[model samples]
Structures are given as structure tokens and as C-alpha cells.
Target chain A: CSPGIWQLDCTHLEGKVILVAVHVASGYIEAEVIPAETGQETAYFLLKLAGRWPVKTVHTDNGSNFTSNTVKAACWWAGIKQEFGVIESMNKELKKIIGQIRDQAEHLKIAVQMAVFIHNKKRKGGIGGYSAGERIVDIIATDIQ
Target chain B: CSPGIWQLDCTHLEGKVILVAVHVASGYIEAEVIPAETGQETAYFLLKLAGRWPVKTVHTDNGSNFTSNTVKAACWWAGIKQEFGIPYNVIESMNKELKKIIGQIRDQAEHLKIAVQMAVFIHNKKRKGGIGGYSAGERIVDIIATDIQ
Candidate 1:
């Protein structure tokens, strides 16, 4: 929840295991409808996101999906410090949000991704009136100038 | 590689993500090509495997694919303590074996299951010179061999 605590985890609310990346600092999240949990796809998605925004550090649970060399190598190559999250609570709230979507029971891919995308734009109290995406943009714009 | 270190992870070696679970205790391995990465599919494959094996625990990566409540709830209800893995070499080894038959897939959502079965046999059954031609099943069942194949 603090700076440098971008928590990366996943969920299966849609009967699909969609990977979700939550920036604990910004509430700005990145998600992917990956094909697997080997951290291969996870690495693929995160590296792509890092190209646009800041991924200063990452906190994750101790899964091979997060700790895989494929992912570790990519993050390390980008100079992103990898860490772990102590709370399982972060994943649940995201799951709950994604789980509430219409037709979520019948379809997973679109349901969860749609929910996560909408969430990234909603204002949260944690960062006060700024959506996760907004905060990311704000940080990028504020300092680069 | 300890007996307690059962590893579970997934890969998209052939355009679709396939979840793989290996029980270090019995040298038992099971894999399924999933339709999606949602926790629901993850729960489906896992609970199914837990039904047949002594799946007392789960060790996976920090991916939402594994961390979802669907996986948590089912494992919890089944009394399986969820754990996590560090080195992905376990999955890479599994995926590499599956990779040999990469072009064999026509459609993972349907046809890939066939490859998984055959891969299981080769991975756990076929005894190669790697371990003196001893299969994973032999070590799991025989309780004599140490190390891997």
C-alpha cells in the first residue's frame, strides 16, 4: 500500500485465471488474459506495461509464476526491484470487483478484463480523486518535465 | 525437490495456457490445457486432481492464476494448504518436455489434452537412460531410487 509496493497477483473469478497487477501506490492496475501461470505470460505483460509507465518495484507472493527466471530476468533487466506481499487481502478485493460483472459466470475472459479496465480508471480514496491510470500519468508527467 | 515441495504452474507453449501440477511426494504429475487464465479454470483442474491424489498442499507462483480465491476456496475446503514455488525450473522442465511435441497440437482447448496424456507417460512412465532407464513412476512406486529422470 506504500510507495514501491506495486502488488502483482492474480484471480479466477471468471472461471478463468486472469493475471492482475495492482499498483498499491497508485491503484493503477494492469491485467492480462494470459495463457498460463508460468510467469512467462506474466513477464510478457509486465514488460509491456513498463515500456509506458513506471514499474519501480514489484511485490508478489512467493510463486514460481512471480519468481520465475523468465519474469525475474525481465524485471531485473529493466532495473525493477522485485519484492513480496505479506497480505492475501489485496488479491481478494480485486477478485471481488471482477466477480461482480454481468455474465461473469458464463464468460470469464471479457468479464474480468472489462472489470479490471474499468477499475483502473475509477477514483479511489487511497490516492484521492485520481484513478490508477490517472495517477500513473500524473507521476510520469509531473517529474519528466 | 523435497517430497513436500509439490509444484503447480502453467505455460502457453502452444498458444494456449496449460496448467501443470507435480506431486514431489509420489512423482505424480498432472496437466490440463485451460481455456483461459481465470481462477475458475485453475480451480477446475486442481480440484479434479485433488480428487484423485493426496493433494494435501499446493505450491504455485504468485500469479493471480494461482492466488485467486477460487483456488483458495477449493483448496481450503479440501484441506489443502496452498504454498508457492521459487525456481521455475520445475515448470520449465515440464514445459520443455511438452515443447518437444509442440507442433502436434491442432487445438489446445480440445486436442491438447491428448498431448498432455502422452507427455505424462513419457515424463513419468518412459524410463530413459537419464535415470538408468528408471521412470518417475518407478521411483515413486519403488521407493528405491534417489534423484530424477
Candidate 2:
């Protein structure tokens, strides 16, 4: 829950691996549906996140997905620092949101995207009444202008 | 070699599955390196393409990656028609370009991005010059303008 630190985790929904990254400072979230949580997929997600956010560090478990050479090289390329974390709490919360729509979500891909999109838009008091999406935009806009 | 149809195929480069899509009409290209040629990965590529370009149809062989329910549903959701094709030749052609840059990619995500960026740049920019000579990139714009009109 600090600036530039992202909590990474994966959950399965409808036989798909949904990798989610949470920006602790802003509560901003980015999730992608991948075939598996392989090192290559994790690296791909890191690249996607780096393109949009200032990813200085990523905190994930010691899973092979995070410790693999591919992910390590990816972080080095993006100038990101790697650390371990206890994001089990956030994972459970996100899974709860994803579970409610599990049966109704005919297309699982769009379902996760929509869930994260809405989750990041809802106002939260922890971030000064700003939604995660709003906080991200505000920070990015400030940094740019 | 017609309008609104794209050739889809995958080639392996340094253990990365490079999925390439070529527009039949303009020779425009889109490529992504993924973990495997699974239906989900292919569908993800399709959705990505649909977001950026007008995907009317996709043509590929009878591989399960193409025939799987996930890919079929992706096409349906994007309103894209599916057809079979002999894209082996086109895929073979693109693979050469992809291979040429494999040495520069260095097995890292960032290097792969740069290699692909360089490759696609060289490819899309190599248009026939002057007097009805149009490159694939320019030709796509011409088609898009006519369609918009």
C-alpha cells in the first residue's frame, strides 16, 4: 500500500487464469485473462502494466511465475524492483466480486474486464473519496502537466 | 488477396509463439508473441485486433486453435466472419522477417517489443513508390477512406 508498489496475484474463473495487479497507492487495478500463469504470461502482463503505469516495484509470492528468469529479465528491462508480499487479502476481495458474476458471465473475458473497470470506478474513502480510476488519472495528469 | 479478409497463422521464434495476422487487401500486419497457440491466446489476439482495426473476417486452417469454441465465440462477439485459407505461404513469408529479428530480440520482453517494432516498421514502410505504387500501409488507408466515404 505504498507509491509505485503493485500487488500481483492470479485467480481462476471459468477455467481461465485471471492475473490481477493492484497499485497499492491508488488502488488502481489491471487484470488480464491468460491461458496459464506461466513466466511468459507474467512477463507479458508486466510489460502491459509498465506501458501504462510507473511500475517501480512488483510484489508477488515466490511462485515460479514471479521468480522465473523471464519475469526477472522483464523487470530488469523495465527498471522495476521485485519484492514478496501478502496480497492474499486483496485476492479474496477481488474473487468475491468476480464470483458474484461467475454464472452470469457468459463471456469470461469481458466479465473480468467489466468487473475491474467498475471496481476501480467506485468511490473509496481510503483515497480521499476518489475512485481508483480517478486517483490514477489525477496522479498521471499531475505528473504530465 | 481480397478486402476485409485476414490470414492468421502462428510461428515459433526462440520458444515464443508469434501469432501474425495479415490483411489480405492491404498487406497490413499485426503480430504478437505469446506462450502458446491456445484458443484463448488466439481469441485475445482477435479481440485486440478488433479493437484497433475493422475485422470483418478471419481466415485460418482447421487447427483446433481456430476451431475451438473460444475462438469461434470471439469472432462472433466481434462480428467477424471465419473462413479457411492457405495462409501457410503468407505465414511462411512473414516468418522470415520475424526470424531475421529473432537474434536481436535477446529473449527479453522489451527486446522482443523493439525487434517487432523495428520489423513491422521496415515492413509497413516498404511501399512501392510513385505512379500507382502503394505500400501495404498506405493501401490500407486508401481502403479505409473509400469505406468511410
Candidate 3:
């Protein structure tokens, strides 16, 4: 079966933690600042990310947050398969941009959202000059004009 | 100017060494086995890679092999601007593939060359097409065609 794999991973923002999901096929991403990387919180965010896109399989690191029964049951009920794998360099690429932002900014959450927006809107030769938002969100020239 | 940037780096294979240049924009890669990471060898492959694609700027690490007078003069004569930048994740991704092969086989030069070529080819042509309908291989073709025509 052609499973749409969404890679899940977490990164630190100053003192806060953020959970991110990257749709591997379309380069679409969803992220949020989580209170902690608990299994219940992780499961909740997984469902939130899956709410927007069709997810067949989730590839994540072998963290206890993902290994716990809470996350497993969430996936089981949602008909999503779980497989552990390595985090992509794209995540690190995002981290590089986030690193450039000022530390302890009051609106850090908005800053993260803004970064994701820019990433989705930026064109690259690797993707035939189409932005990630344009590809995944079905925005093309005819539609825009 | 919208100068296209290509990042260059080197990695070892068994006892041999391979020089890799990655087109950051298109994700297109050119790699070859070199005798060593000398300035002369680095300059030669840079020219060879630029032969197929239009290279306005080249980004490399601050290695002496990249900073030596030989490479500087080569770029100066070729009209390619030189800049220093960090290594790409795509390069690391390719390295991981090469490392896997090295771990299992532990072979020699011909093996190293063949493996490096295969890795580069698979990354450009065989991998999943990202975002757009085109693969990195196809995107590079369009870039060359549009630029030259």
C-alpha cells in the first residue's frame, strides 16, 4: 500500500519544547509548543497534526513518549501504523532558522508559526520552484490568478 | 542576482576519498573519487561539475583544500565566485547511504567509485519527488535547458 508517512519529532526552543510533524511526501508540516513530551500530550498533538492531513504511517524516534500505551492506542484507533525511524535534516534545517531568532522572545510561539509560514511559502529548485504550501495546499498559477 | 549556490565537501570511502558537490537549489549532485583532498584535485572537480551546470557561486567549508591559491585562481579565471557555507543535510543523507555500504562490504577503489556513483544517481533520480511533480534529476534538467536556451 502507498502509505503517506508523516515523520514526528521534537525540538527545543529556548526552554520550551515543540512537537513537529512533517509530511514527507509534500513537505507540509504542523507544529506546536507542547507543555511536555508526555505520552498523553504527544498523543494529543499527533491527533491534532493528523486532523489536517491524511496520515497512514507515522515515523518517529524510539522515545518513551511515543512508546507508551497512550500514543499506541491513539494510533491504533486512528488506523495509523507506527514505525520508528531517524529524524530528517529538514527538521535540522528548520532548527537553524529558529536558532537565528532572539532567545527568550515574548512572542516565541508566533515566531515559530512565522518560521513555518516562510518555509512553506519559499520556492526552491528541488521542488520545481513551487512552494511547499503551493504543492500540498493545491495552490497553482491558474488558481492564484 | 539570483546566483545559484553549490556546496562542496569530501568524505572517505574505505581507503579512497570522494569529492562531492551539491547543487543546493536543485539538489543535483556530482561526485568522483580523487587521489586526495588537495587544492588541485578540488579545483578540477569543481570545473568538471560546472561544465554540466551553470555555477555562479560555489560554497565550501574553510578547508585548506578549498582555500588554497590553486582553487582561488581556478575560480577567478572561471568567473565563479567563491563563498563559504555550512554542509547540507542532503550531503549528510548521501553520506549515510555510502556509510552503510562501507560498513557491510569493506571493499576497494573500484567498489568505492561504483558505490559513490550509484548513491549519487539514486538520490537524484530514484528518490521520492519532493513537493513538485519533478524529481531532483528532472528539476536539474529543466534548469540547464532554460539557462542555456
In order, what DockQ does each candidate have? Answer: 0.01, 0.05, 0.01
State the lDDT of candidate 2 residue by residue for A1-145, as single tens digits: 4456888888776677889888787776777687788987788777656644456789878899989998887688667898864356666666776777556446677656546655665666545565665565455434433
lDDT of 1 by residue, B1-149 (tens): 45434678887855778887776765556666677988888876665454333345677878887888777866775567887746442655766666664344333313455445445544565456665554565444232122211
Model 3 chain B: ten consecutive residues of lowest lDDT: B102-111
Candidate 1 wrong stretches, greater than 4 Å? A1-5, A85-88, A104-106, A124-128, B1-149
In model 2, how large is the Cα lDDT of residue A131? 65
lDDT of 3 at B138: 53
Candidate 3 docks with a DockQ of 0.01
Task: Give the Cα error of residue A98 in candidate 2, in Å.
Answer: 2.0
Model 3 lDDT tens row, A46-86: 65444333467998888899999878876775568999752
For every model in order, the fraction of real contacts preserved is: 0.00, 0.00, 0.00
lDDT of 2 by residue, B26-47 (tens): 7777677776889987877776
TM-score of 1: 0.44
Which residue pairs show collisions in model 2?
Answer: B127-B135
> Which candidate has the highest TM-score of all?
2
lDDT of 3 by residue, B12-91 (tens): 86678888777776776667677788987787666544433457788787888999987886677456899875543156
Worst 10 residues of 1 chain B by lDDT: B140-149
